[PDB]
Amino acid sequence: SSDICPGFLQVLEALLLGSESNYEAALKPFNPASDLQNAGTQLKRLVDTLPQETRINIVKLTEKILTSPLCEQDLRV
Amino acid sequence: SSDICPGFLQVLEALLLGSESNYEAALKPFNPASDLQNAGTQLKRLVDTLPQETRINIVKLTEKILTSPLCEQDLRV
């Protein structure tokens, strides 16, 4: 379900896994305040310090929340 | 809009800001594989190393994506 706003899954799919460009780029479509933008970069580094497998699990971790009867809720249908 | 699955905003609201308990707890309703669970903790630490204000911005950062005409999309209505 498109609750996983494509734009949102985009950056995560790359904070966690793709180059600094991959982030900065992932981000332009939002146009965050530089201060904010900057906070983002600060984050991207520590994330970069963890192993491919640690970081991969962080991706699987999100996918565990994102696809359980908790998240993909039933409003009306 | 309830696209921000409450459960999902829950943990983030606390990876980024609340105690180790706050995370571990935020997480139980999902029941992740221990290995996965563990990956999560690894994350929570580096996040804990950044300043309150850095981390706060990471919260504002998400809220910037999450509430733009990009994310809160128009399917049908």
Curated annotation (Swiss-Prot), chains A, B:
Subcellular compartments: Secreted
Keyword line: Disulfide bond, Phospholipase A2 inhibitor, Secreted, Signal
Chief place where the protein resides: secreted
One GO term of the biological process aspect: response to glucocorticoid
Induction cue: By glucocorticoids.
Domain of life the protein comes from: Eukaryota
Tissue-wise expression: Club cells (nonciliated cells of the surface epithelium of the pulmonary airways).
Record carries keyword GTP-binding: no
Single GO MF annotation: polychlorinated biphenyl binding
GO cellular component terms listed in the entry, alphabetical order: cytoplasm; extracellular space; nuclear envelope; secretory granule
Keyword Secreted attached: yes
Function per UniProt: Binds phosphatidylcholine, phosphatidylinositol, polychlorinated biphenyls (PCB) and weakly progesterone, potent inhibitor of phospholipase A2.
Family label: Belongs to the secretoglobin family.
Subunit-structure text: Antiparallel homodimer; disulfide-linked. Interaction with LMBR1L is controversial.
Protein name, per record: Uteroglobin
Organism the protein comes from: Rattus norvegicus (Rat)
Residues of the full protein shown: 20 to 96 of 96
